[PDB]
């Protein structure tokens, strides 16, 4: 079994609008495909004693075991690599369970579609699935060591990636709300909402944290200034740069209960708590001195506390306690340890509420000064502490004490963080009763934390946990507001890209930033920010995460949805243009069933509030209707349309062309919007398909909520000039002459260029062309296309590119062109350079000339050197 | 140094 | 603007207005830059990676920690115009701007070595623009260029510097606008490059450089060219500071013309800077002073709002405290925070 | 708190007088079936609808004698929530959870027994309810418990002594 | 640092 292909979705696609993650592999089963199973002795076996979690997949029989009531009649290994990928990812505890199987190709080519939840852990499984699946098929078994070693790869891969915990807090809430969420390339930040309504976070720091307030929460010494300047209550205390002077010094600080710490910060060590002895401020004089040159501050009774404010208002309160074991009968403290440590919420690092305790020489240290150790009997209810200090990754308990605090401390809380500017912060306070005044138990504020942790308040070892994220989230998005920008997503097979240039030239009416995708640059303000096809995902996202959108407008094409999925999940509006049988064979697409499959994704992006623009005159989009969850909207070239009558009857809108006008039809009132010959981009009214692009620009800005007279002025003022749009209906005038460059593809395009030249109502029709050599059997259709339109019909098809021998493509156009009418001067000339295309002197006044170039830079240069208008 |  | 101004107790701070319509500033940081966007303007390989992904032209360039792969990065990067770098930020030292040969890119190495392991990228020409931007919006543009001394007759480079360097507009430090030229070992090292030392005399109308980059306060000059940027690149310029967050930003472009298009000329943007200092603004030695602090005061105190509080003083040989405690009272019933200060105790609701 | 009139004053004629009256923000009102029976709802729709219990009072009136019925007549206000509201139904009633299933609005729950599969099934999709436990009044929203206050401590309740008296405030907490 |  050989990986031919592997894609990444990350969005709606074709496979699933909700399965957003999802990998699909190329699968050639160069051996097997022609043996199910049951041509593969001990095959069934063998897969379950190495995988016997097996049981658990349901396929077509809604059973347990629904899957090994099979496996031993094979399905040719379709759900056999399928469901050892999904299980390798549950067996390391990465829930995926979507998968399907579908046979493309040449017989035996299949794609294999599974669920993920981290990338490179998926696409990890999927190879092992193939490896465990192709061993078990060559002999009966798979070594131990072979899977327990690739299970140990996926949990690696699974724990890279990972968010920590309060980002997790955030990112987790801000889904519930609604709020879409990315990850940006530097600094692992996090992004929250799209254009103009963005936001940042990196853990717990903000947008909305200023830099000096941070600063000066990192610096004691400030801290303490500007709090007691401030008539806040702070420990006392002195400086001294590790001179014996430290029996004088608690005479202005308050006897000898005072607190040692190392001058300067480099983690809670050579700190003596409570000094009641001369010598002991010696010893702690000299583990002090070990760092820079906070000492004899004084000591103050009570427990120590931690308060959560988010928006200069208080969101929780907790108690924290460091690890212990107590005198619960007349046992050891090693025999303490091991009872309490049993404690089934004790588990690991991050993993349960608790955690273990783990004794070592600073453990004994701590036990050593309470006259204890590990051999020794606590009485009863005696209480060994094992840690100087708090802290539930060490083993301690934090307790909920946030309905319990009195309401003057509350007041001094909001007060401190204000004071010392920052939004998100933690305040260390030490008193003996948190539910009267700190004035009145003689308590502290210790430390100021900027951009504290949440675990203690979010999953509390006693009392009641608290959303401390719906605070945050409500302060980076205040209620009322929105945090998403408009989406205007365009799609079928033709006309993709005029509709997008015209629906961004009219929202730019109103004076807003417009942002936009095509396949020729992308575009703010009509400043080019990149050049080149840029319809896809990758571009979807340039425009999204810009700063100063305000509305964007997505061409989006069908390479984009099968190589990757939708770069937005959802969209207020969405407009189908067409569907044409354009691109078949290709991206395993092979009919036009499937291709409607494609283009559908957009409508059903739709939000519920927002709408669906359908083409009424197209019965493969009409029917799209059916399956949108948002209000439909359609459009058509004829107001005699059934559906279009069926619908404005039950006060629904469309758009549609009637006596020479452009019109939108709002239950039963009529409004015009303007003439088609009044409009630029159409050809005097001469264009069909430029109508009908208009037609679904006006609709979809009218259904978002624009005003008609900013949509007349729009249409009024836009231009598809040469050398603006090129190769799309350029037309030039040279005296009384004209000649018409355009790019058509599918057939459709030869059609639509067809109708334009037909009512062309000066003198001969003469056309200079035809496809290239990569097209498929549609040549003669062409042929066919050509015949019934111009009087005059030349063949150049013998390109410069030559993708395939010669002049064949030319005389299969000739073919074609000769079975339909076989009198129009049906001379093949081969040569297009200056060739067929200079040659427009054997065409009278006002004829008209259509040229079809394998390049359009060359055609319209050409043109240019007769001098035209 | 994040979560203080 | 009669804004009443304080300095505070702790890390040079200074506070503006007074009550709930304080500001604090910290030369050129404030109460309104956020730490993420400062944080992410101090690291070079952050801020080039979020602007190559926003479409903004910047430097093309490489990773090579001190391994002799040189000769292959070119191939990568563009040939050998080449800048090399030490690898951290440790001042303006053992930077080679126009490496054109092997050797030369080896003495580079040698010198780039010897800081923690910004290398080969594209060398682009132009001159060293600084574009200050306040709000979103442009304030100011200046031009930078190195101290010098030119071919002005046939004289010596150390007699033209004494002839320079007499100008009454040099004023020792921060005292007049230009200031001192001072020879070293590292200007010689500069002059040697250009095929001259200090006893060489100089064609008339050459250039000799006696710095590697401009600074004002080395010697060299600042030349406004506020009025001469082209709207594209105003538009840019708002764009990149946007796109890294910061509120008050220096921007370093490299152009042959401010005056045209970046994408026509070939330049780039070459360095972000949070808390812009600004001197070469205020008093450049061509073209006209700008008031940009103006622009400051306008986003901390927007046009329309206050930046005081109400204050009733109460005075008289009797009956203040008692008049005090009523006035406050009487206040407190609109529902507004007072704070109100007596002989018996500081009060606020 | 100022008297506009007294008497029975439930039905759509009473419902009209606040309805109309040009200071008033929001609007409470209780509804009887004598009112609905007799002349139908004054309003067409509304934000919350209330059901709190269907029992056996007032049969064979109004030509209603069954409890199925009878049921048939307290669903109108719940059948008459906006898409964009909500209705609060009783989940420890078998005729009023019922409801559920006809209410083309959101459905939040309330109950005096937190261990009822009504409102686990639901608390488990992200829905809301209310439950009395452990003493308290609390708001079950998601994964979340919130508590409001203690039974106790409300003076409706006579100390936590009067069952119905909890439920009714329970039904008021939820529908603020 | 300030001043850059
Ligand atoms: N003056 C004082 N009186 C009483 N207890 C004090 C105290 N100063 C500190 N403590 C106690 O010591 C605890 C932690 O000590 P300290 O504040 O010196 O550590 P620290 O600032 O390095 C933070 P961390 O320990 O998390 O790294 C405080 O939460 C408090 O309980
Ligand atoms: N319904 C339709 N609307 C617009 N153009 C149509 C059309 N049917 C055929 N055409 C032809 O299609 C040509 C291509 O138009 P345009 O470039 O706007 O389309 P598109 O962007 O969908 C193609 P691509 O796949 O390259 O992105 C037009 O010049 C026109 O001749
Ligand atoms: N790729 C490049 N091409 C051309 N010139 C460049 C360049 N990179 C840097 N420079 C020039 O070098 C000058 C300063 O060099 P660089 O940016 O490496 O210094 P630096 O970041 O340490 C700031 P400072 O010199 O003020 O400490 C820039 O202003 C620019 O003129
Ligand atoms: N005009 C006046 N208004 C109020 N009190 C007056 C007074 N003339 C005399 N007194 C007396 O003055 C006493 C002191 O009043 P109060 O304490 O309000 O004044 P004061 O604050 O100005 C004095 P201090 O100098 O101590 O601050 C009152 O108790 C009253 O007996
Ligand atoms: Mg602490
Ligand atoms: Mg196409
Ligand atoms: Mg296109
Ligand atoms: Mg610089
Ligand atoms: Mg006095
Ligand atoms: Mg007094």
Request: proline share 5%.
């Amino acid at each position: 079994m050989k990986i031919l292909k592997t894609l990444t979705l990350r969005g709606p696609n074709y496979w699933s609008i909700r399965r957003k993650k999802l990998i699909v592999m190329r699968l050639d089963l160069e051996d097997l495909a022609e043996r199910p199973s049951n041509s593969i002795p001990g095959f069934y076996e063998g897969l379950i004693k190495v995988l016997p979690s097996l049981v658990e997949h349901f396929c077509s029989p809604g059973y347990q075991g629904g899957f090994l009531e099979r496996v031993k009649e094979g399905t040719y290994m379709g759900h056999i690599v399928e469901h050892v990928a999904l299980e390798l990812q549950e067996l390391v505890g990465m829930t995926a369970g979507f998968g399907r199987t579908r046979e493309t190709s040449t017989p035996g080519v299949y794609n294999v579609v599974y669920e993920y939840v981290d990338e490179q852990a998926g696409r990890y499984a999927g190879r092992a699935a193939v490896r465990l699946c192709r061993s078990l098929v060559d002999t009966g078994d798979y070594p131990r060591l072979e899977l327990e070693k690739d299970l140990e790869d996926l949990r690696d891969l699974g724990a890279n990636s990972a968010l920590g915990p309060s980002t997790e807090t955030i990112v987790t809430e801000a889904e519930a709300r609604k709020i879409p969420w990315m990850l940006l390339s530097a600094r692992a930040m996090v992004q929250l909402g799209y254009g103009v309504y963005q936001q940042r976070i990196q853990a717990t720091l903000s947008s909305h944290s200023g830099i000096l307030g941070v600063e000066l929460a990192c610096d004691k010494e400030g801290t303490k200034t500007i709090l007691q300047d401030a008539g806040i209550p702070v420990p006392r205390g002195t400086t001294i740069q590790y001179f014996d002077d430290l029996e004088e010094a608690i005479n202005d600080v308050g006897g000898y209960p005072v607190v040692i710490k190392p001058l300067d910060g480099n983690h809670g060590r050579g700190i003596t708590i409570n000094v009641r002895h001369w010598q002991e401020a010696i010893a702690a004089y000299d583990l002090a001195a070990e760092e820079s040159k906070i000492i004899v501050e004084r000591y103050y009774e009570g427990s120590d506390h931690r308060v959560l404010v988010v928006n200069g208002k208080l969101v929780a309160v907790a108690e924290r306690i460091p690890a212990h074991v107590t005198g619960d009968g007349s046992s050891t403290i090693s025999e303490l340890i091991e009872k309490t440590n049993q404690d089934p919420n004790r588990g690991d690092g991050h993993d349960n509420i608790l955690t273990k305790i783990v004794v070592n020489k600073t453990a004994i240290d701590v036990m050593e000064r309470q006259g204890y150790n590990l051999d020794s009997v606590l009485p009863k209810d005696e209480v060994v502490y094992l840690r100087a200090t708090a802290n539930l990754s060490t083993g301690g308990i934090a307790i909920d004490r946030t309905d319990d605090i009195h309401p003057e401390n509350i007041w001094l809380m909001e007060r401190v963080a204000k004071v010392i500017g920052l939004d998100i912060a933690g305040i260390d306070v030490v008193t003996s009763d948190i539910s009267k005044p700190l004035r009145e138990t003689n308590g502290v504020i210790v430390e100021v934390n900027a951009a504290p942790g949440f675990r203690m308040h979010v999953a509390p070892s006693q009392g009641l946990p608290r959303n401390v994220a719906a605070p945050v989230l409500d302060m980076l998005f205040p209620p009322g507001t929105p945090s998403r920008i408009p989406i205007l997503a365009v799609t079928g097979t033709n006309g993709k890209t005029t509709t997008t240039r015209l629906l961004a030239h009219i929202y730019r009416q109103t004076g807003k930033t417009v942002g936009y995708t095509s396949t020729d640059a992308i575009y703010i303000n009509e400043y080019c920010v990149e050049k080149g096809d840029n319809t896809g995902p990758q571009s979807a996202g340039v425009i999204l995460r810009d700063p100063t959108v305000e509305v964007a407008v997505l061409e989006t094409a069908r390479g984009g949805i099968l190589r990757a999925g939708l770069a937005f999940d959802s969209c207020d509006v969405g407009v189908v243009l067409n569907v044409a049988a354009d691109h078949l064979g290709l991206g395993d697409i092979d009919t036009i069933e499937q291709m409607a499959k494609v283009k559908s994704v957009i409508a059903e992006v739709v939000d519920p509030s927002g709408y669906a623009v359908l083409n009424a005159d197209d019965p493969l989009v009409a029917a799209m209707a059916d399956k949108v969850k948002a209000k439909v909207a359609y459009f058509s070239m004829n107001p005699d349309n059934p559906i279009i009558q069926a619908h404005v009857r039950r006060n629904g809108i469309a758009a549609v062309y009637e006596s020479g006008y452009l019109s939108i039809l709002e239950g039963s009132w009529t409004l015009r919007v303007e003439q088609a010959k009044l409009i630029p981009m159409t050809m005097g009214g001469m264009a069909p398909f430029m109508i009908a692009n208009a037609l679904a620009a006006c609709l979809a800005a009218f259904v978002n909520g624009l005003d008609v007279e900013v949509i007349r002025q729009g249409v009024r003022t836009f231009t598809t000039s040469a050398e603006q749009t090129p190769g799309r209906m350029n037309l030039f005038n040279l005296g009384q002459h004209h000649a018409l460059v355009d790019y058509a593809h599918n057939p459709a395009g030869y059609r639509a260029v067809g109708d334009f030249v037909k009512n062309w109502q000066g003198q001969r029709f003469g056309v200079v062309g035809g496809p290239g050599d990569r097209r498929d059997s549609d040549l003669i259709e062409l042929g066919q296309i050509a015949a019934q339109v111009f009087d005059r019909i030349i063949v150049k098809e013998d390109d410069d590119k030559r993708g395939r021998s010669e002049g064949e493509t030319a005389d299969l156009i000739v073919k074609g062109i000769l079975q339909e009418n076989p009198g129009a001067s049906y001379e093949v000339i081969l040569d297009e350079t200056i060739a067929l295309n200079k040659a427009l002197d054997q065409v009278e006044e006002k004829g008209l000339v259509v040229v079809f170039p394998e390049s359009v830079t060359r055609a319209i240069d050409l043109i240019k050197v007769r001098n035209p208008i | 140094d994040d979560d203080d």
